[PDB]
Design an enzyme around this catalytic site. Structure first.
Site, PDB file in Angstrom:
ATOM      1  N   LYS A  92       0.857  -1.170   0.000  1.00 27.60           N
ATOM      2  CA  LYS A  92       0.000   0.000   0.000  1.00 27.60           C
ATOM      3  C   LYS A  92       0.898   1.226   0.000  1.00 27.60           C
ATOM      4  O   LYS A  92       2.013   1.176   0.529  1.00 27.60           O
ATOM      5  CB  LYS A  92      -0.931   0.021   1.223  1.00 27.60           C
ATOM      6  CG  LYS A  92      -1.592  -1.325   1.532  1.00 27.60           C
ATOM      7  CD  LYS A  92      -2.956  -1.455   0.856  1.00 27.60           C
ATOM      8  CE  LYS A  92      -3.580  -2.831   1.096  1.00 27.60           C
ATOM      9  NZ  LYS A  92      -3.364  -3.305   2.494  1.00 27.60           N
ATOM     10  N   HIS A 145      -6.734 -14.293  -6.357  1.00 28.53           N
ATOM     11  CA  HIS A 145      -7.489 -13.308  -5.597  1.00 28.53           C
ATOM     12  C   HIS A 145      -8.968 -13.457  -5.917  1.00 28.53           C
ATOM     13  O   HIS A 145      -9.340 -13.666  -7.077  1.00 28.53           O
ATOM     14  CB  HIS A 145      -7.024 -11.880  -5.908  1.00 28.53           C
ATOM     15  CG  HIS A 145      -7.483 -10.870  -4.906  1.00 28.53           C
ATOM     16  ND1 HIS A 145      -8.795 -10.459  -4.812  1.00 28.53           N
ATOM     17  CD2 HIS A 145      -6.805 -10.175  -3.961  1.00 28.53           C
ATOM     18  CE1 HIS A 145      -8.911  -9.568  -3.844  1.00 28.53           C
ATOM     19  NE2 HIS A 145      -7.717  -9.370  -3.317  1.00 28.53           N
TER      20      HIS A 145
END
EC number: 4.1.1.39
Lengths: 162, 450, 105, 453, 455
Positions: free
Chosen positions: D157, D276
């Site tokens: 991030k 994912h």
């Protein structure tokens, strides 16, 4: 019009022209693959027009299909499709497409029996001022070596015949 | 959340993607914290700030909740309008825009329900997508078909038919007057009918029926496959054998696969009919999911030449078909959608319709549609060809009526009964069972721009 | 059960009985009313699947007199009595034909 | 009407049949047998009608048929329909076709208020037609040389705004700190600020530099999710061209066709595949209308992945579904059929989402060794850097595992274990300040001596 | 061997591969221990248990003898039934299954003779193999042929004929009424007739007879080749030139090649005729070798559209070849239920010294879904290949028209043929020339499982 005709309406004008008595019709130098007439659709309907007028006149017909394109992959893709569908002649803007693309396209055309009509788009940016630039007879010699079967050539008459 | 992500004074840019989320929050949540949370969870994933954030322009790289509205009714739900700078997404990728908007926020614990109502695709992003391989107008020119909706028949049973028996039902339909027949969504390559054998006999059926009617004929050969390689192989074989149209299940086969098939179709001059298999898993719950008009815009960018489209209904049909669709809350259209020159997609009607629905279907959908009759064709008592003729007669007389000025939906039974005096097939069949807005905008813009 | 009788077709309105002069007229009136420019085409019966028919004259642009078209249809049918004859309505906004159909098979 | 053809309470499923369990919430007028029957018809031979073409076929073989009805414990509005489908209704090796067939039509059926696919029984004879994981747990462990502990990851991030090289710097710091993996987010594809090829070069550079400085195999889930299959594969090939051990895909948003193809490519090329589950909550959150994640779990195992994100009772139900060789029926955990996988390998369960050092005891105690533990802010947010957060988590994972191996109750004794390890680890100590298989093995033994009996 | 590999209480799982070995043991060995040895030698082949075994799950990864029976009318031999877990094998590889079962154990000195009689391929393994490229029903649809057995001729002499002369025989045959002509199994690409020239002239013949008859014609062009690259080149040229059918010698060319060729035939729409050359080397000796019904099953899985099938055992393997389910039947040498599921069936081919006088017994034994291949029985006709073909074709149809009428065509043989010659001079001259439920069970069971399922 160079702009706004669909592939099919475009082919209609080609068909009506070719059956009249003209040997060739011609994409404009600005006709490549615009949103109102994608190149594949244009080639199909032009070739249909070409064959239909040829069958009705008993005279060989052509349409300079314009393979001028953003990359040499696109140029060669469009050239092969023209051979694939039977079109006898294509067209390239040697100066604005460029001499590397054009020499390569000329070589492809000789390897494949496809005639090559050359458009001198943009020559006047270069060859009009008599005190700065490159005279058109220079661009004329370049094109012949690079390769083309037709070239647009027209001035003061003396130089033009020259 | 509200500190960073609720930006009420932000006016969106023409280049931003905009999303309109219908949020249903738990009782004790303020509407702006929920709207800012949905902007953040669908853009940056978090509310906090770690040291790597400070290496970046946090002011530019984030979605903004910039307005909140009431929902007529559900006083426990509000519309949250969110802007996303065009730079958050990969160009030419419905997959990446879709993942970014819906890949994460819909599990957000803090809302009782989240519903994606609409997405404003800016013209700068539309221009990066391949779009329909051909679109309505190019397709009419290729098939040489103008002046009416096109007619189609989904072959049944979906199951248990050999390739050759399957081709038989195709042939009898196409020769009857239908333009298209259609592989079912579930027809791929099953043991009772391997795809290569089906493709061969269907194409046989298609050429025999075309030569006996002098009208161009199609059948949507379904290339939905287990892998992209199998999908492309099947699409290539349809081209090799001359088939003019194929089909793909864009949601279940998937957006990456479909975007690729669309581009192959445009490269190869093959029309592409799209099925919306499983849309209802996603778009039916009015409180949680993604509305079918979002799914409709996704498909036009991704690429289709037909799309099954079932007030709201006529909204997403405009979105599918016209160059410019103005905002119209009465149709659940929350944003102006400009498509530019990106061609529109044939609207496909299906599901249990027969001759009696014809006047309305011509009335509602208009000319640029495909009307798909399952049992409405096969179920005719005199066989597939007779029922195709019945449907084709009904369609053509409803269209001649509309052109003549009549209210086809009210004079429906009268229009039909009169044309059945010239067609036994039709008479027995009866016994058995946006544009003007888009062009007004183009002319106005052509004259004075803004 | 009745047995379906197969025969050639010619796209829109060809599963309807042929058109006299009155029903043709309502179609030209529709087209002019939609802003479309009517046009007339003809081709030998064996070539009706061609994309490009012979064009009769030019499209009637801005033309608002149904009877003017109707007469040219008659004039084309007289010039080529064995040819099929088709009516088309060019739509300039869509770059398509808003309507087409054969008037004489 | 459907009841007569599609309601067969006398049918006992063949062992080769695909079975489904739908939770049907009927409209007020419709009775259970007719709802079950419609669901079964609209998800197989999508009509009640008999047209002449049907008589060309064996209508009795080629149909789904409902064969049992059950109440839903504590919900009178809803009931379970159990439906059987002959293996012949589906293309082999194609979860795309079984998915489409099961869920691609029936969910719009207006005579039902809510329809929810709870479980799907894939017969051994159909499982053997699908590729499965490109490697699976035990093969991946061998390739990576990691045993006796859960694997450790971190997601970089911000998901937005980082250049390729800046991104690789957060990757390097994490990996050199003791984390096994780092991770592209689901939305990280090829956006203008970090073009995919540049990201792959610098991530791999960071991967090699951290591996050199630690002596432990490292990887980073490079996201190959792409607009087209051509782009997906190009990205995958480049990650192999440069030596990356593991790539990543968003199987639902990219699609089942692309993902099956990617898994095939991975197995043919020796690249691990981290999966994912983006978008899944669109489908599996609402308990009255959609597809339960445990069904999405089984489709991924068959389509192919080496890791899958899995997120009380149901959660460890679908973990067993994801990892174990055989899973017996258990309604206390939402498993409505025995699921036999045979020799098809299990897939790592991946835990992520707002977890830090303090969750370690519960995570090890719940997921066990054959899991990946993904830390977002729980590694980036450390106050000495990424390297220290990585180390803190690594130490706290290892302490829990040593403590577990020693017989301790790591959940009941969570605080003590982490504190006793905090003493030898300044990184973990300050980080503390800032914040099933038995069954499958038993059944295999018994079937070895007795066989069918 | 016995304590680990004899498991009389084990019940086979449905995923298991089962084998039936007829063992003739050496005089001083008991039946238990010999079964357990055959199971060990055909799966783990362990002569000394070592430490690496202890790294594995030894109870799972092993064949196991689970039953023994007497051989009726032979006290010296017995049947050993053996189960192999599906995990012992590579999916979709008859090569691997074959090698595993028969690659080591037939040299076991402690046995006097060993014969593999039958192999139970479980459905879950059948689904991993490609199967016939087309199968009987697809092929019939592709060739537009229904209601009668198909008819073929094998061109002779096998040797010495130029490509063009060879096409001449082909043309004369096809034009007289046969559906198929055939390359001999030895015809590959020899000096006197290079394959490329053979393919060109045969295709020319095929097209000329097809135009002159209005019925689809075919000729099994043999692509058996030294190398896979040569095999695939020959198959590609047959497709290039329009040929509907090719031929492979699957035993002598081998299973790896044959399996790949069947995959290619399905991907390219080419029908695939399979010759069983070499089988009698393997399958003739009733005491030592592999029974032809195993080789039948291997070919269905590996892939073929026709297979040469050449009494009770014969009718048994035809069922195994053509039907969807075949029940156990010791009287026809079928030792296990064999379920094929949706895997299509294969044309059975009858050849070898047959002429018109065999036609009633052939239509009656083989039925419709069969090919009747006449070697000298077509060429030997005193009027040529066309008249010989027509005679065979008339005799074939009249026997089919008789049977559809309910007549006992085998009993009333000489009468049906005689009423037929009264309209075919060609059939009459040929008669002076030469002297003299499997389906229904399969359907009954599919309907049973369709209504009740497990019952």
């Amino acid at each position: 019009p160079k702009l706004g005709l669909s592939a099919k309406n475009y082919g209609r004008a080609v068909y009506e022209c070719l059956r009249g008595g003209l040997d060739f019709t011609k994409d404009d130098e600005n006709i490549n693959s615009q949103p109102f007439m994608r190149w594949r659709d244009r080639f199909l309907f032009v070739q249909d027009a070409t064959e239909t007028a040829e069958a009705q006149t008993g005279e060989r017909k052509g349409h300079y299909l314009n393979v001028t394109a953003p990359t040499p992959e696109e140029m060669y893709k469009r050239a092969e499709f023209a051979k694939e569908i039977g079109a006898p002649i294509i067209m390239h803007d040697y100066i604005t497409g460029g001499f590397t693309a054009n020499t390569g396209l000329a070589k492809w055309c000789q390897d494949n029996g496809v005639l090559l009509h050359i458009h001198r788009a943009m020559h006047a940016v270069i060859d009009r001022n008599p005190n700065h630039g490159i005279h058109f007879r220079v661009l004329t010699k370049i094109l012949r070596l690079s390769g083309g079967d037709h070239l647009h050539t027209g001035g003061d008459r003396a130089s033009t015949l020259g | 959340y509200r500190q960073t992500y609720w930006m009420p004074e932000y006016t969106p840019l023409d280049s931003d993607i905009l999303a309109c989320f219908k949020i249903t929050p738990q009782p004790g949540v303020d509407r702006e914290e929920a709207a800012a949370a949905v902007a953040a969870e669908s853009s940056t994933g978090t509310w906090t700030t770690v040291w790597t954030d400070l290496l970046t322009d946090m002011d530019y790289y984030k979605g903004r909740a910039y307005r909140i509205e009431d929902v007529p009714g559900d006083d426990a739900a509000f519309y949250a309008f969110i802007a996303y700078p065009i730079d958050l997404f990969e160009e030419g990728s419905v997959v990446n825009v879709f993942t970014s908007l819906v890949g994460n926020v819909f599990g957000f614990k803090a809302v009782r329900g989240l519903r994606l109502e609409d997405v404003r695709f800016p013209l700068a992003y539309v221009k990066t997508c391949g779009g329909p391989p051909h679109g309505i107008q190019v397709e009419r020119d290729k098939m040489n078909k103008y002046g009416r909706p096109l007619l189609g028949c989904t072959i049944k049973p979906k199951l248990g038919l050999s390739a050759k028996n399957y081709g038989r039902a195709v042939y009898e339909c196409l020769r009857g007057g239908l333009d298209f027949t259609k592989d079912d969504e579930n027809i791929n390559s099953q043991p009772f009918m391997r795809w290569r054998d089906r493709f061969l006999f269907v194409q046989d059926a298609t050429e025999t029926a075309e030569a006996q009617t002098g009208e161009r004929k199609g059948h949507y050969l379904n290339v939905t496959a287990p892998t992209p390689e199998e999908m492309y192989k099947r699409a290539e074989f349809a081209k090799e054998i001359g088939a003019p149209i194929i089909m793909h299940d864009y949601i279940t086969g998937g957006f990456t696969a479909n975007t690729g098939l669309a581009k192959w179709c445009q490269d190869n001059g093959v029309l592409l009919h799209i099925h919306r298999a499983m849309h209802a898993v996603i778009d039916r719950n009015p409180n949680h999911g993604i509305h079918f008009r979002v799914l409709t815009k996704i498909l036009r960018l991704s690429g289709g030449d037909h799309l099954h489209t079932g007030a709201s209904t006529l909204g997403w049909i405009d979105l599918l078909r016209e160059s410019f669709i103005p905002e119209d809350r009465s149709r659940g259209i929350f944003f102006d959608q400009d498509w530019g020159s990106m061609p529109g997609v044939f609207a496909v009607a299906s599901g249990g319709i027969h001759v009696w629905h014809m006047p309305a279907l011509v009335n509602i959908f208009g000319d640029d549609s495909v009307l798909q009759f399952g049992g409405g064709t096969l179920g005719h008592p005199w066989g597939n060809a007779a029922g195709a003729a019945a449907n084709r007669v009904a369609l053509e007389a409803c269209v001649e009526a509309r052109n003549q000025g009549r209210d086809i939906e009210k004079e429906g039974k009268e229009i039909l009964t009169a044309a059945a005096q010239h067609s036994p097939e039709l008479k027995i069949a009866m016994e058995t069972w946006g544009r003007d807005l888009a062009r007004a905008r183009r002319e106005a813009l052509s004259q004075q721009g803004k | 059960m009745q047995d379906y009788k197969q025969s050639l077709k010619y796209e829109t309105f060809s599963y309807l009985p042929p058109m006299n002069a009155e029903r043709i007229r309502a179609q030209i009136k529709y087209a002019i009313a939609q802003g479309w420019s009517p046009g007339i085409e003809h081709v030998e019966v064996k070539n009706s699947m061609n994309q490009y028919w012979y064009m009769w004259k030019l499209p009637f642009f801005g033309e608002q007199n149904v009877d003017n078209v109707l007469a040219e249809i008659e004039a084309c049918r007289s010039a080529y009595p064995t040819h099929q004859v088709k009516l088309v309505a060019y739509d300039n906004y869509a770059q398509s034909l808003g309507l087409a159909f054969v008037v004489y098979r």
